[PDB]
Structure formats: structure tokens, C-alpha cells
Amino acid sequence: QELLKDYIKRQIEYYFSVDNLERDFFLRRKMDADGFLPITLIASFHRVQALTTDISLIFAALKDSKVVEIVDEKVRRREEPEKWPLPP
RNA sequence: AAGA
Numbered sequence: 001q002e003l004l005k006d007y008i009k010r011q012i013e014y015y016f017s018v019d020n021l022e023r024d025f026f027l028r029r030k031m032d033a034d035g036f037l038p039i040t041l042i043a044s045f046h047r048v049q050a051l052t053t054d055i056s057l058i059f060a061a062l063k064d065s066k067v068v069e070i071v072d073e074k075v076r077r078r079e080e081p082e083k084w085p086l087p088p
Numbered sequence: 089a090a091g092a
Contacts, residue, residue: 014091026092047091 008061011047016068016077021084028086035081036074
């Protein structure tokens with residue numbers, strides 16, 4: 001599953017890119033105050049779900065990234081995550 | 089789900 005992991009990784013890094021975050025109000029409203037989102041929320045997004053429903057594979061894809069960081073079941077952008085959360 |  002290494003090729004599939006790479007596509008998943010890059011898709012999720014797009015969601016956490018500054019360019020996306022500047023317009024992604026839904027994602028920002030779902031963040032906690034520290035920027036964290038449930039990984040299973042990201043797994044539901046259409047372009048990730050198309051690729052896989054394997055949660056281990058999604059976690060493995062994210063562990064490979066220098067854009068995001070995982071803590072338990074949650075993920076956030078590594079750089080300045082606190083700037084992005086928004087009121088629900 | 090205008091790549092939530």
C-alpha cells in the first residue's frame with residue numbers, strides 16, 4: 001500500500017496547507033483550540049474516502065508527513081496550528 | 089465537501 005499511502009498523505013497535506021486553510025471554514029470550525037481535528041473526520045472527506053477506508057493506512061500516511069502531527073486520534077498542522085481554529 |  002505504499003503508493004496509496006503517498007496519495008493519501010498528499011491529499012491530507014493539502015487540507016492542512018495554508019492555501020486551503022485560508023478558505024476552509026468547515027475544517028477550522030471543527031478544530032479544537034489547539035488546532036487538532038479527529039483523524040476520522042479527515043477520513044470522511046470525499047477525496048480520502050475515495051482512496052481508502054482503512055484507518056491504519058490513513059494513520060500510517062500521516063506519520064510520514066512533516067506538514068502535520070498526530071497526537072492519539074487527532075491531527076493538526078505542525079506550524080502555528082493555534083492561528084486557524086474558528087468558532088463553530 | 090467549489091480538494092470540506
